[PDB]
Amino acid sequence: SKAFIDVSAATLWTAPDSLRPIDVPSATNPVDLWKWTKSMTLDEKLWLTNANKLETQALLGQEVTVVDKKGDWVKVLVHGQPTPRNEEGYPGWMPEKQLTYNQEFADKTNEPFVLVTKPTAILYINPSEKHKSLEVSYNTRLPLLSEDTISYRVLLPNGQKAWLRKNDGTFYRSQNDIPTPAADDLINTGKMFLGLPYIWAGTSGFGFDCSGFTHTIYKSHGITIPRDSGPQSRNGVAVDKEHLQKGDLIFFAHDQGKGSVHHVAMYIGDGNMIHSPRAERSVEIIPLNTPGYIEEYAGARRYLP
């Protein structure tokens, strides 16, 4: 059955009940994802990848299909994150307490919405008995209720009403009606995140992995590409090295480009690329001709019409 993400961003696990104590702030409702990421050492971040712990992250209001339940954990398919693993959505395990269902929100899912357009922004719940607020990610979509000279009012997945400053968001009729981006729009979007530390499976303005970054940049501009780097590398139109253009996605694969794809970056022209590269680093711009990367070059895809 149908449910909605009830936290700024939910982290989905490859198995239920796999949290360390340091991961607790990712699993509560509400979350504290700055506490989560900023508290971790490098080794603690790398464990997420090397012990194969995470699947993806889903944002506030994103719809999921609940498919299994083990204790306090549910297995869900995240709609809007394409993967060859499952035709309905991206699979993984998350705490049930991070999901909600409100009929009014469910009915308004196909109405015009506000898309959050800064890396993160503050939503103010109004009315709220305890004057609550929520820091939300870039690419969060909530149904638009009303607009004044300074703000948009929106509906939260739990049925509460909230507002954000107009400068923190944009409204659109639907995903399908987000205008087609120019390559520079995509680049400018990526640039907003320069210096944001990497996290495995990161799919929000609280931290990205390389494919979560590319998926999020495209999705926020109306183009849904696969969640993961391997599938990203086999969708869109194949581009040859001599024909690289701004916005093109560039892929790197193990064994000198011959094996599995494990990195993706976006070409930004003049020989440079932007990416969220690895746990040791942050969203950054580097040359395509960087040692390591250049030997693993495994092709390029174009997603812009």
Author numbering: 29 to 333
The article reads:
The crystal structure of a YkfC ortholog from Bacillus cereus (BcYkfC) at 1.8 Å resolution revealed that it contains two N-terminal bacterial SH3 (SH3b) domains in addition to the C-terminal catalytic NlpC/P60 domain that is ubiquitous in the very large family of cell-wall-related cysteine peptidases. Characterized NlpC/P60 enzymes are almost all γ-d-Glu-DAP (or γ-d-Glu-Lys) endopeptidases. The first SH3b domain plays an important role in defining substrate specificity by contributing to the formation of the active site, such that only murein peptides with a free N-terminal alanine are allowed.
Here, we report the crystal structure of YkfC from B. cereus (BcYkfC) in complex with l-Ala-γ-d-Glu. The final model of BcYkfC contains residues 29–333, one dipeptide l-Ala-γ-d-Glu, one phosphate, six polyethylene glycol (PEG) fragments from the crystallization solution and 265 waters. The three domains of BcYkfC are arranged in a triangle such that each domain interacts with the two other domains. The active site is located at this SH3b1–NlpC/P60 interface, whereas the SH3b2 domain is distal to the active site. Since an oxidized cysteine can no longer function as a nucleophile in the reaction, the enzyme in the crystal is inactive. As the dipeptide was not added during protein purification or crystallization, it was most likely to have been obtained during protein expression in E. coli. Since this dipeptide is one of the reaction products of BcYkfC, it unequivocally identifies the S2–S1 binding-site cavity, which is formed by residues from both the SH3b1 (Glu83, Thr84 and Tyr118) and NlpC/P60 domains (Tyr226, Trp228, Ala229, Asp237, Arg255, Asp256, Ser257, His290 and His291). The dipeptide is stabilized by multiple hydrogen bonds. The l-Ala methyl side chain points towards a hydrophobic pocket defined by the side chains of Trp228 and Ala229.
